[PDB]
Paper text:
On the other hand, low-resolution cryo-EM structures of the 80S-RAC complexes and biochemical characterization have identified the contact sites of RAC near the PTE of the ribosome, and more importantly demonstrated the separate binding of the C- and N-terminal parts of Zuo1 to the 40S and 60S subunits, respectively. Structural analyses indicate that RAC on the nascent-chain-free ribosome is in an autoinhibited conformation, and in the presence of a nascent chain at the peptide tunnel exit (PTE), RAC undergoes large-scale structural remodeling to make Zuo1 J-Domain more accessible to Ssb. Our data also suggest a role of Zuo1 in orienting Ssb-SBD proximal to the PTE for easy capture of the substrate.
The best resolved class C2 enabled us to generate a reliable model for both Zuo1 and Ssz1, based on the crystal structure of CtSsz1-NDZuo1 complex and the AlphaFold2 predicted model of ScSsz145. In this specific conformation, in addition to the previously characterized interactions of Zuo1 ND with Ssz1, two new inter-molecular contact sites were identified. The first involves the first helix of Zuo1 ND (residues 33–44), which is sandwiched between the HPD-containing helix of Zuo1 JD and the IA subdomain of Ssz1 NBD. The second is between the surface of Ssz1 SBD (R521, K534) with the N-terminal sequence of Zuo1 JD (E83, D89), through polar interactions. Very importantly, this conformation of Ssz1 is stabilized by a previously unrecognized interaction of a sequence on the IIB subdomain of Ssz1 NBD with uL24 and the H7-loop of the 25S rRNA. Upon this interaction, the H7-loop is seen to undergo a conformation change, being pushed away from the H7:uL24 interface. In this conformation, Ssz1 sits exactly above the PTE, placing its SBD close to the exit.
Residue numbers in the entry:
A (entry chain B): 1 to 457, 490 to 538
B (entry chain A): 1 to 49, 70 to 282
Write the structure that this text describes.
């Protein structure tokens, strides 16, 4: 038996493990602490080492020896990295031309750790949590990255996993990885265009994916390293400052530990109020020896966060314009990440888009899953498909001659009754491809119009004529557009009852 | 889904220039999806490997069947695809295996790539692939034998002059393959006794047809459906079955009742 293969979503704020059971479904591997999305944090208390939400607990108490958000510093030198992102955690220093961190071990001795060392020992117990649940050793994994990591980072992730003995067998982009599990659980009845939304704690990722006969392709991607759940969190930090200084006449912002425990207890409400209408905060010894008790509902939270949430809908708008699409054309918006649990962010997207876009989120009655989980579950699905392959076959499958498919830029289709353009094979379609349209109610003699199509900001405008075909005294017809590997367009129009078929060739 | 222009000009002439790759674009895609792992596999793996052979088709009897889709395969005739258009239902199980071994080397996709053929013939190969498991299954072949309208010989035309034993001769074996009862009474000749005629029509009046219609299911139960959707398709699919059972049985009754008067 080959080694088990698992999927890794490595995130700024959370990491998750997925694995395909012998019952051939997805199962989420949890940590020993019982939380599925393991946080990406390490805290050293002397010689002892802590991970996860346990390691996030010492951030308020020992912030100089607690590290966080170490995904964006991998593979690139320190001068291209913003140090103030981990200004709340451990300082990031200059180590060997890349980013390193200053830690303190037992007896006050100082150890200088590379960020390459960080990912290895983070994956050390991501290995341990996976093999304890499954009961067998793991050696290889599929790692999901954002699409803006270059190849020199991917080799560094391959190298740092090789420091501990993990073989990163494949790299896949997170919008491509997250969508597959949604497509496996809920297959699409029609070929659609969808937008993957990854709203993390410290960064926001949006990418536009065309779903064409099971092939997932980039139209355009967008990233914002400044928009995220931290801005949701920091807006509440100044919010909780407001009632505290009017009631108790103290400034909680001027103490780092007071601001950290305020930042810690505000971080819980982002998860807590995603499922309930209100949340309560009780903090012993906040600042100047003062306790604090307050209850905050959904509506005043949304009244606070309407500036940031409008930026989140604005970030959706820019990636559509970057690929030059119209929000009438887009079929769905797919959501992943812990920010996507918020029901306010769900409601903004039906308002700022047409009603024909179905927003795939936690609130959806028909197509819903866990947004923090949906990235990793797609990686295990790719893991199961490649589990039959050795390294030679998958690397040959990874070759640019094979992974590059030519597509079709300008869409084709059928002309309507009033001269409107009805696309059959849409835009952005790879070939060879064949689609069937059943005109069952078609009675009489028909002229079948094949035209190229032009799209503008959305009505379809009739474009360049491809061919024309006609049928006589027909009672139900099928229209077939066939494109081969050579780009030749062949159109078959078959009568549904008599079998009288007229074939067009180009 | 909307209406059609419905024009009476009825032209079947292409007027534009040849299809260029200027509206064709070529950036790569991400290696993800189960259909990536098959679309790559056709250009990566592409794995493919006597008195009874005199009964086969030497050349493909339906030339249009080569261009037919693998997805639209249920309207495709598998007997013309297998090379058994002469014999159809009466071919044995080993004959299907020998016919499958003939057609796998004639239409080898690597040899089709060697002969310069397109990938459209590989779509006909997926017809050739799953025809084998359909025709080696006892149920699935019999289900395909239940819908073989090409082998369904019609009764002869009304108002014409014909021999009764020669024109209705091959007709009654078309449903005798659907007989659950053995032995099969024969039509006989002009010198047949009255008791044999009474034993004939009673067999056809009390006829037992095993013909089913699961292959005519346009909607099939998907495994991605929930519990009510697999039930909802089945009652509709049964409603197609018994209607086509009773109508063909009434057609068979009219097949019985016309031969009595003629």
């Amino acid at each position: 038996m080959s080694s088990p293969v698992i999927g890794i979503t490595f995130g700024n704020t959370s990491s998750s493990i997925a694995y395909i059971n012998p019952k051939n479904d997805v199962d989420v591997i949890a940590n020993p602490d019982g939380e599925r999305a393991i946080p990406s944090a390490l805290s050293y208390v002397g010689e002892d080492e802590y991970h996860g939400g346990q390691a996030l607990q010492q951030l308020i108490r020992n912030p100089k020896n607690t590290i966080i958000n170490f995904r964006d510093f991998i593979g690139l030198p320190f001068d291209k990295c913003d140090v103030s992102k981990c200004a709340n955690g451990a300082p990031a220093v200059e180590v060997d031309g890349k980013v390193g961190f200053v830690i303190s071990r037992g007896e006050g001795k100082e150890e200088k750790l590379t960020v390459d060392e960080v990912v290895s020992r983070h994956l050390n117990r991501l290995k341990l949590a996976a093999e304890d649940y499954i009961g067998s050793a793991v050696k290889e994994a599929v790692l999901t990255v954002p699409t803006n990591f270059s190849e020199e980072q991917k080799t560094a992730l391959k190298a740092s996993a090789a420091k501990i003995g993990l073989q990163i067998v494949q790299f896949i982009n997170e919008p491509s990885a997250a969508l597959l599990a949604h497509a496996e659980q809920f297959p699409f009845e029609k070929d659609v265009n969808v937008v993957v939304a990854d709203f993390g704690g410290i960064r926001s990722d949006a990418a536009v994916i065309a779903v064409r006969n099971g092939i997932f392709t980039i139209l355009a991607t967008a990233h914002d390293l400044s928009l995220g759940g931290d801005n949701l969190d920091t807006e509440l930090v100044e919010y909780f400052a407001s009632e505290f200084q009017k009631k108790y006449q103290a400034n909680p912002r001027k103490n780092a530990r007071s601001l950290a425990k305020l930042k810690a207890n505000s971080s819980i409400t982002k998860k807590t109020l995603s499922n309930a209408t209100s949340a309560t905060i009780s903090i012993d010894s906040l600042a100047d020896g003062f306790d604090y008790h307050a209850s905050i509902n959904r509506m005043r939270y949304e009244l606070v966060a309407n500036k940031v949430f409008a930026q989140f809908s604005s970030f959706v708008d820019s990636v559509i314009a970057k690929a030059e699409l119209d929000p009438l054309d887009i079929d769905a918006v797919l959501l992943t990440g812990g920010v996507s649990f918020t029901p306010k962010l769900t409601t903004n997207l039906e308002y700022t888009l047409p009603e024909s876009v179905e927003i795939l989120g936690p609130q959806n009655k028909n197509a819903s899953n866990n947004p923090n989980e949906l990235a990793a579950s797609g990686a295990a699905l790719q893991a199961r498909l490649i589990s039959d392959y050795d390294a030679d076959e998958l690397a040959e499958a990874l070759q640019p001659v094979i992974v590059n498919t030519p597509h079709l830029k300008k869409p084709i289709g059928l002309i309507g009754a009033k001269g409107e353009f009805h696309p059959v094979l849409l835009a952005e379609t790879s070939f060879p491809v064949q689609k069937k349209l059943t005109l069952k109610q078609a009675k009489g003699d028909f002229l079948i119009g094949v035209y190229e199509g032009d799209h503008h900001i959305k009505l379809y405008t009739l474009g360049t004529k491809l061919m024309e075909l006609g049928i006589k005294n027909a009672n139900g017809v099928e229209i077939i557009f066939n494109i081969n590997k050579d780009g030749a367009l062949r159109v078959t129009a078959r009568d549904l009852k008599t079998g009288n078929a007229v074939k067009g060739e180009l | 889904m909307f209406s059609l222009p419905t024009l009476t000009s009825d032209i079947t002439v292409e007027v534009n220039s040849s299809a260029t790759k200027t509206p064709f674009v070529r950036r790569p895609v991400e290696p993800v999806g189960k259909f990536f792992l098959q679309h790559a596999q056709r250009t990566l793996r592409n794995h493919t490997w006597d008195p009874d052979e005199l009964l086969f088709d030497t050349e493909l009897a339906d030339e249009d069947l080569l261009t037919h889709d693998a997805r639209d395969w249920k309207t495709a005739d598998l007997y013309a695809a297998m090379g058994l258009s002469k014999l159809r239902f009466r071919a044995t199980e080993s004959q299907i295996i020998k016919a499958h071994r003939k057609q796998v080397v004639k239409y080898h996709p690597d040899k089709q790539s060697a002969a310069g053929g397109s990938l459209d013939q590989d779509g006909f190969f997926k017809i050739i692939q799953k025809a084998f498991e359909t025709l080696t299954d006892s149920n699935k072949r019999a289900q395909y034998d239940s819908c073989d309208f090409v082998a369904d010989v019609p009764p002869p035309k009304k108002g014409t002059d014909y021999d009764f034993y020669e024109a209705w001769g091959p007709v009654f074996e078309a449903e005798a393959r659907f007989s659950k009862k053995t032995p099969i009474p024969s039509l006989g000749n002009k010198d047949s006794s009255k008791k044999e005629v009474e034993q004939f029509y009673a067999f056809w009046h009390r006829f037992d047809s095993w013909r089913t219609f699961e292959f005519l299911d346009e909607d099939v139960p998907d495994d991605s459906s929930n519990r009510d959707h697999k039930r909802y398709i089945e009652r509709k699919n049964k409603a197609a079955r018994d209607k086509k059972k009773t109508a063909d049985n009434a057609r068979l009754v009219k097949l019985v009742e016309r031969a009595v008067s003629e």
